[PDB]
């Protein structure tokens, strides 16, 4: 998982959600996992 | 809540007691109980179905509407049919055997065999040394039990070895090309 | 000359408040007012004219928002690394009397007389108190319109 202040969709399958007050990007490909921080 | 606004059809032999905020569901397979969150109410709709109503079109009203609709439908479909989950193990040397409907023994390449106990509403059923299944009346409990069984040895991305879901799409790569 | 109370001239009574589902802030403000006797026309800052307050069901005090796990209470022993911190929810579960006393003391003036008056607050986490002999009268937290 990448922890970055700037999280964006990288592929077309990545989905942006707000989990527990934090913006996250979830994707089938594990490389695209992201979390704001 | 497009899901919530759809009704819930009570099947034959299923007893649905709406005791205000607290609800009982009896059926052939067992008994389930649930409390709906307060700003959501449940009606019988001529005693042959179930309806859930959001008192306002806000966010929490609609969210709890859909949640409660899906969860009540889940309990009724469970008490009328149950919940089944198939888990298959791959990789040489890995085996599963049963000491009863609620007791599993796994040899997942560990130093020693590992023992798995089941909750009261969970019953195992093994048919093959490399395939088995879990059944119950609560979807959440069945799912979490399957998740724990998988967590015992999750599939790998090199030879798949590990407990995997029946339809699980396990990722894979190649190290020593 | 303005009136001034004389020692034991003002008769101190006993009230009991059921903290059942009552916000901690309202409970503490009401308790401080009663303990200092601000509801009496005979009030005087320099003479204790307040009443005894028995708080019951302090374990069921209502908290709004995420206070039960994010509103923290700190103590320091006075030596390096001597801080302990516990959330108000844990403190209400374990030692509700300490939580209510901390709130009321914070809301009460910083005085020797205030320290003396805070002893008049008897806080119990359960629904039962041992002061039946003192015969506390029920007190209802209310508001006066406009």
């Amino acid at each position: 998982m990448k922890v970055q202040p700037s999280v964006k969709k990288i592929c077309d399958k990545c989905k942006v959600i707000r989990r527990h007050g934090r913006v996250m990007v979830i994707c089938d490909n594990p490389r695209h996992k992201q979390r704001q921080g | 809540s497009r899901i919530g606004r759809l009704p819930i059809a009570v099947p034959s032999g299923v007893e649905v007691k709406l005791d205000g905020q607290y609800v009982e569901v009896k059926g052939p397979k067992g008994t389930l109980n649930f409390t709906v969150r307060e700003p959501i109410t449940v009606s019988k709709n001529d005693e042959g179905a179930i309806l859930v109503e959001r008192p306002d079109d806000e966010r929490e009203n609609r969210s709890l509407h859909g949640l409660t609709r899906t969860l009540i439908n889940n309990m009724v479909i469970g008490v009328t049919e149950g919940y089944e989950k198939k888990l298959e193990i791959q990789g040489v040397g890995y085996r599963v055997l049963s000491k009863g409907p609620k007791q599993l023994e796994f040899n997942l390449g560990f130093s020693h065999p590992v023992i798995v106990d089941a909750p009261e509403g969970i019953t195992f059923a093994v048919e093959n040394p490399t395939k088995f299944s879990v059944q119950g009346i609560d979807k959440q409990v069945v799912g979490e039990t399957a998740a724990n069984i998988r967590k015992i040895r999750k599939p790998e991305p090199y030879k798949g070895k590990g407990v995997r879901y029946e339809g699980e799409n396990v990722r894979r790569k190649v190290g020593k090309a | 000359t303005t009136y001034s109370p004389k020692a034991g001239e003002v008769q101190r009574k006993w009230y009991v408040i059921d903290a059942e589902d009552i916000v901690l802030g309202r409970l503490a403000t009401t308790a401080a007012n009663l303990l200092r006797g601000k509801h009496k026309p005979q009030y005087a800052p320099h003479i204790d004219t307040g009443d005894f307050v028995v708080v019951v069901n302090a374990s069921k005090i209502a908290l709004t928002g995420k206070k039960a796990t994010d509103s923290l209470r700190y103590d320091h022993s006075g030596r390096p690394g001597g801080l302990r911190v516990t959330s108000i929810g844990e403190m209400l579960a374990k030692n509700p009397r300490r939580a209510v006393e901390r709130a009321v003391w914070g809301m009460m003036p910083k005085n020797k007389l205030s320290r003396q008056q805070l002893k008049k607050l008897k806080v119990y986490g359960g629904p039962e108190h041992p002061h039946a002999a003192q015969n506390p009268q029920p007190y209802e937290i209310t508001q006066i319109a406009q």
């Binding site: - | - | 022993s77 006075g78 030596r79 390096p80 001597g82």
Partner: protein, 214 residues
């Protein structure tokens, strides 16, 4: 909450034995004498489960009327010492019951509690292991000094708990996991493999090992 067996005794001294592997073992000799249950504490009346034991030879003219009445209610002869044992099985103990060293077998692990030997006012170098200053190279009248005791204008103070000189010894010390070597109950002697706190003749509390064993 924990069930503990216990007995009271006196530190008689030490000697040495040879075990079955021909190993030299230091043993403390404890006169784990007869103890009598003077009082049993129950949650109903006292709020916790514990057993008060007696033990000790006392002169009849040195036992006062309150103590004499306490022992008379206990139904036993007066004893010099009285020590409680926090056990969760206190009930199984009856008033005036007899307790002897045979409460411990030949290989039980025990915890021995006693008051350590006193040393008076000790320096930092002795009571805290402070390394002092050098003996030469210009050290000026501070060979056993504690060095610095703080910082500077911040915090312009000495932090609480700083280790400095003071009176060392005479304190409750429990030494754990000592394997009882032998028990001879007919004369009340216990041989415990190890060294226990306190001077010869001090009172010792021998309890079952809290951590069971190593």
């Amino acid at each position: 909450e924990r069930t503990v067996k216990g007995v009271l005794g006196t530190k008689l001294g030490m000697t040495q034995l040879w075990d079955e592997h021909n190993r030299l073992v230091p043993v403390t000799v404890i006169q784990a004498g007869p103890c009598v249950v003077t009082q049993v504490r129950t949650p109903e009346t006292d709020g916790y489960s514990a057993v008060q034991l007696g033990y000790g030879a006392v002169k009849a003219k040195n036992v006062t009327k309150p103590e004499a009445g306490h022992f008379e209610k206990a139904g036993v002869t007066p004893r010099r010492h009285l020590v409680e044992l926090r056990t969760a099985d206190a009930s199984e103990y009856t008033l005036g019951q007899e307790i002897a060293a045979d409460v411990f077998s030949e290989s039980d692990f025990v915890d021995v509690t006693g008051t350590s030997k006193g040393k008076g006012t000790a320096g930092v170098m002795k009571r805290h292991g402070f390394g002092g200053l050098r003996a030469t190279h210009g050290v000026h009248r501070k060979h056993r000094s504690p060095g610095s005791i703080g910082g500077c204008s911040t915090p312009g103070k000495v932090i609480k708990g700083l280790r400095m000189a003071g009176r060392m010894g005479v304190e409750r010390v429990t030494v754990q996991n000592l394997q009882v070597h032998s028990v001879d109950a007919e004369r009340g002697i216990m041989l415990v493999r190890g060294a226990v706190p306190g001077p010869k003749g001090s009172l010792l509390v021998v309890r079952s090992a809290a951590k069971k064993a190593a």
